[PDB]
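Dear colleagues,

For the upcoming journal club I promised to circulate an example of a predicted protein-ligand complex. I picked one with nickel (II) ion because it came up in last month's discussion. The inputs are reproduced below in full, followed by the predicted structure.
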Amino acid sequence: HPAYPMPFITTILGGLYPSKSILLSGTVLPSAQRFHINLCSGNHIAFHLNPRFDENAVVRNTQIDNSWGSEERSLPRKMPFVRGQSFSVWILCEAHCLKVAVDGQHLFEYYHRLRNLPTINRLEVGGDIQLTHVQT
Ligand SMILES: CC(=O)N[C@H]1[C@H](O[C@H]2[C@@H](O)[C@H](O)[C@@H](CO)O[C@@H]2O)O[C@H](CO)[C@@H](O[C@@H]2O[C@H](CO)[C@H](O)[C@H](O)[C@H]2O)[C@@H]1O
Ligand code: NI
């Protein structure tokens, strides 16, 4: 299984809605600094998932009108992403929040800030990973 171009951008026809799943698989580069997965709406970023190896954290935020909101960094366990290690991310959309799992295990919830779900119809992946598969 080869790799996707990076950054990878694709429309999510029909946008989001409860029960909608977006799956991604790949491998973190050996000396990755950071990588991100964005769910966008027009010129806004409804959900920014940003694992950071320099900061050993997983940052989540929303960018509306070019303004980043309050970051969410809480984690129930140790940073699951590891340099040079393969991973899978499952983003499940629900009515009030996005539920995110990493390597088959729930990691966190992110309450919707941009609530018009159908308008969130673009996926962007960028950063220090080798993207091997996407399921929208
Ligand atoms: C720790 C932190 O909040 N880091 C963000 C940084 O904050 C400033 C400052 O506001 C803060 O008080 C201080 C505390 O130590 O740290 C920094 O000096 O601000 C930058 C720029 O907004 C953030 O980086 C951006 O984060 C976005 C998601 O929130 C997105 O990933 C951008 O790509 C990234 O540049 C720091 O996360
Ligand atoms: Ni496929």
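Two points we might discuss: The pocket of ligand 1 is lined by residues 48, 50, 59, 61, 68, 71 (CB under 6 Å). The CA atoms of residues 20 and 93 lie 5 Å apart.

See you all on Thursday,
B. R.
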